[PDB]
Amino acid sequence: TVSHEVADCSHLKLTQVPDDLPTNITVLNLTHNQLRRLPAANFTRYSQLTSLDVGFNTISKLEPELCQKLPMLKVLNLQHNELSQLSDKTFAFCTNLTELHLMSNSIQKIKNNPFVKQKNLITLDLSHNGLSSTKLGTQVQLENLQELLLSNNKIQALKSEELDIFANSSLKKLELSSNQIKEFSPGCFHAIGRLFGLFLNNVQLGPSLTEKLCLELANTSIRNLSLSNSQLSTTSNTTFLGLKWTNLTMLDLSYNNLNVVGNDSFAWLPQLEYFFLEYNNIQHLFSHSLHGLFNVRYLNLKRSFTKQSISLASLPKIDDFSFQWLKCLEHLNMEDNDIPGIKSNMFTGLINLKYLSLSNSFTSLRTLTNETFVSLAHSPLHILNLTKNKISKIESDAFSWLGHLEVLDLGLNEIGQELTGQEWRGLENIFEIYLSYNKYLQLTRNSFALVPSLQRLMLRRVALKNVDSSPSPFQPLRNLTILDLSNNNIANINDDMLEGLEKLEILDLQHNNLARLWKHANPGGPIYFLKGLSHLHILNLESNGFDEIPVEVFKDLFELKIIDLGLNNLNTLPASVFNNQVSLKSLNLQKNLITSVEKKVFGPAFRNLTELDMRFNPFDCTCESIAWFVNWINETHTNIPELSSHYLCNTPPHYHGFP
Amino acid sequence: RLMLRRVALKNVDSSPSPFQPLRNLTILDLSNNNIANINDDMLEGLEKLEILDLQHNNLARLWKHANPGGPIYFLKGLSHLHILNLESNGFDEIPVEVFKDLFELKIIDLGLNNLNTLPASVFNNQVSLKSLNLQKNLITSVEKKVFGPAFRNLTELDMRFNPFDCTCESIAWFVNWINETHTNIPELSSHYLCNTPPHYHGFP
Numbered sequence A: 001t002v003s004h005e006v007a008d009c010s011h012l013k014l015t016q017v018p019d020d021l022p023t024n025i026t027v028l029n030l031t032h033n034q035l036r037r038l039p040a041a042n043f044t045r046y047s048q049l050t051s052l053d054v055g056f057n058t059i060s061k062l063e064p065e066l067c068q069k070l071p072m073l074k075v076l077n078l079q080h081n082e083l084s085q086l087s088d089k090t091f092a093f094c095t096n097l098t099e100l101h102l103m104s105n106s107i108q109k110i111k112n113n114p115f116v117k118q119k120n121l122i123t124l125d126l127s128h129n130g131l132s133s134t135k136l137g138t139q140v141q142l143e144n145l146q147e148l149l150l151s152n153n154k155i156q157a158l159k160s161e162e163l164d165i166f167a168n169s170s171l172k173k174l175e176l177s178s179n180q181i182k183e184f185s186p187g188c189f190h191a192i193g194r195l196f197g198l199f200l201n202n203v204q205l206g207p208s209l210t211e212k213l214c215l216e217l218a219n220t221s222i223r224n225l226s227l228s229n230s231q232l233s234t235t236s237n238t239t240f241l242g243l244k245w246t247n248l249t250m251l252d253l254s255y256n257n258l259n260v261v262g263n264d265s266f267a268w269l270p271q272l273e274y275f276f277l278e279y280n281n282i283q284h285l286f287s288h289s290l291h292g293l294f295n296v297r298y299l300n301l302k303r304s305f306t307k308q309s310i311s312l313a314s315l316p317k318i319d320d321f322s323f324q325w326l327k328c329l330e331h332l333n334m335e336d337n338d339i340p341g342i343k344s345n346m347f348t349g350l351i352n353l354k355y356l357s358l359s360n361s362f363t364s365l366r367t368l369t370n371e372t373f374v375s376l377a378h379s380p381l382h383i384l385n386l387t388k389n390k391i392s393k394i395e396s397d398a399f400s401w402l403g404h405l406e407v408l409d410l411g412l413n414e415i416g417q418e419l420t421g422q423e424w425r426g427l428e429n430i431f432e433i434y435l436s437y438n439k440y441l442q443l444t445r446n447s448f449a450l451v452p453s454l455q456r457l458m459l460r461r462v463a464l465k466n467v468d469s470s471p472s473p474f475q476p477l478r479n480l481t482i483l484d485l486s487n488n489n490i491a492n493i494n495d496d497m498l499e500g501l502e503k504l505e506i507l508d509l510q511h512n513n514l515a516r517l518w519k520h521a522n523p524g525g526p527i528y529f530l531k532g533l534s535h536l537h538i539l540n541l542e543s544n545g546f547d548e549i550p551v552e553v554f555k556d557l558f559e560l561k562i563i564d565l566g567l568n569n570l571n572t573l574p575a576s577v578f579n580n581q582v583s584l585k586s587l588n589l590q591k592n593l594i595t596s597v598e599k600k601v602f603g604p605a606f607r608n609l610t611e612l613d614m615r616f617n618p619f620d621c622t623c624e625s626i627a628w629f630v631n632w633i634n635e636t637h638t639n640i641p642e643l644s645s646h647y648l649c650n651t652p653p654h655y656h657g658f659p
Numbered sequence B: 001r002l003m004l005r006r007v008a009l010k011n012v013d014s015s016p017s018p019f020q021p022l023r024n025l026t027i028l029d030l031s032n033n034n035i036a037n038i039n040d041d042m043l044e045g046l047e048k049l050e051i052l053d054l055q056h057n058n059l060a061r062l063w064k065h066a067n068p069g070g071p072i073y074f075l076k077g078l079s080h081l082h083i084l085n086l087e088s089n090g091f092d093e094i095p096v097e098v099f100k101d102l103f104e105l106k107i108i109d110l111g112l113n114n115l116n117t118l119p120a121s122v123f124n125n126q127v128s129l130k131s132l133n134l135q136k137n138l139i140t141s142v143e144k145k146v147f148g149p150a151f152r153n154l155t156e157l158d159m160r161f162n163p164f165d166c167t168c169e170s171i172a173w174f175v176n177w178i179n180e181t182h183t184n185i186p187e188l189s190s191h192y193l194c195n196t197p198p199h200y201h202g203f204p
Helices: A161-168 A207-216 A372-376 A627-634 B172-179
Strands: A006-008 A027-029 A051-053 A075-077 A099-101 A123-125 A147-149 A173-175 A197-199 A224-226 A250-252 A274-276 A298-300 A355-357 A383-385 A407-409 A416-418 A432-434 A440-442 A456-458 A482-484 A506-508 A538-540 A562-564 A586-588 A611-613 A649-651 B027-029 B051-053 B083-085 B107-109 B131-133 B156-158 B194-196
Parallel strands (some): A006 A027, A051 A075, A147 A173, A197 A224, A407 A432, A432 A456, A482 A506, A506 A538, A562 A586, A586 A611, B027 B051, B083 B107
């Protein structure tokens, strides 16, 4: 039972509460135990507690004298117990509670009056119980109550007289999930003082019962309403008839298997702002289907449409100008769909759009024609995602209509072409383009000459071709800050590729083949392709097969902090190479062939670090080669994980395996 | 003679050995097949086998002491085996009694592996060895207790790319045997370079 200010007794198999703890503890936790009985006599010492988590235990019943000793107790958790009996005196003396969880206590019925004697309660939980009615008392109480949970109960009817208690209570959440309610009484919710949110997830209503529900929500202050997995197969213009007389803002219709959406079905929600339709089975979307939704700020359509079936090829078709009513839409998530393709008028009318996601939303978008994005002409789009859409070819002027675009995500596709550079025209305010995990790209001289404002360019596992052109393709990228060129098997890299890249900070060249470019036997001399990088911060060169490092390759990296050189064939490093890295933080040399660590090369490197990664190396135990290293190991503040596990001496056999 | 080089053998680890009826088999090639699991009794009854090639495969696990069920001694009963090839198998440990019955072994090939330490008194039974090939391995020490009987009377030696250790406890007997010998050791002063310690770094 470790405790400094928080007392924890989780999964310790306690049978009785401990009697040796500080008096001034505020929270005391005994979750996952078998306290069969919780005597109040053992809590004489414990009188300064605020929260008591005693859930997941085997308490049968409780006594009034438990919270007599606790005048400041505020949270009382009784999850997963056998408290099937409640009385007026169960929670009488203690009234300062603001949290009370009774989940999964197998409570059958509320008899007379368990909850009048407290008025400061905020959250009440009654989930996974055997209650069949929402009656929790006779008179009116729980004035300050805000959170009520009654999910996974056996309630079949929601009567008006059962909620007369909440005539003067402001309720923000009515969790009635997984309960088979099939009858609604008039005035059931009008009896509630201030209803702000209703949650009816996994509750089988149907379209007709949903219409009666909306009629029962007439003339109230509801803000949120979720009908997830409510079996709403179809909707009509009168299904949400009752919601004019309220000002609902959040509506959830996920997992309802909504096959078809009726015309002008959503025209009756003028104040809707957040709408959810994810994981749905929509087959056809009409032009007037989303009418009346001119105030929605966020729409979700992830898996909202019918998946492709080989039996009928029922591709979900979207009519033109279907989203024209969304004048104030600012966030559209429409990932994982089987839309056949982009039409010329599908996104027309979006004048306030700022985020569009199209991750795996099309079956086969092979060609990105210049006429594809004409529907986003007036849309001030900033972030666009085209991942997993099987893009195969990008024509010129494909993104010429997105003048306000800032982030472009084209990764995880099958893009195989040669970059003429005319595909990027019109992206005057672009900042990021993602192109990782494609088939092959062949760079040219003017590949990125039309986007000088580029800052991050990711090309991980894209198999770059013609990367060694005499003029550097990243020359126009004056403001480039992050560049990834990993897993491309790049062989030849010119010296002047990174000239003029003063603002570059992150460079990744891991998993490539540049071993020849650094050997002294390379014709033309070693390539010092890291010159002028005054602001470079993170450098990665893993799995490059390097066998020799030139002495003046890191001469200008004055702000280098993170360097990675693992999984290489390094054996000997030149002396006085790391002098200029006065601000290094992490050095990673795992799985190399180095044998000696000495001051003349690794002295300035080990000035002030925070991490070190040198696991799998055949170190040599000799006073000429390791004595300074093990001395620096003896006293240091750098984090060296598994120092005694894999830093094993391989040679000589006298010290074979000795840490 | 049964040649199966680069044929990608599947279901090779059946409980009854498919080469059991091959009583008169003399040459068997099983190279470049990425064979992973090999049973102990695969070569039982192969008294007349002479040439065995198992190069460019994956049998590293079958010889480690941590392998469940014990190491596989799939070279037992091979009294007439003459040429054995185990290149590029990734071997990291050799069982002590795997070559216990090869009384007529003359050519052995173990290059391009990850061998670092060999058990003492392993090559006692190879009194008629001719060529030993251990190029491109990770061995560091050569001593009498393992390589003494191996260097009795040879004609070839192939140990080019190894990180040898220059210490009187580990190389003194080896360089002494280099000083006087009749075995053919080509490029003896070209690639037999001392890697460790850095004092003798690159010194032949």
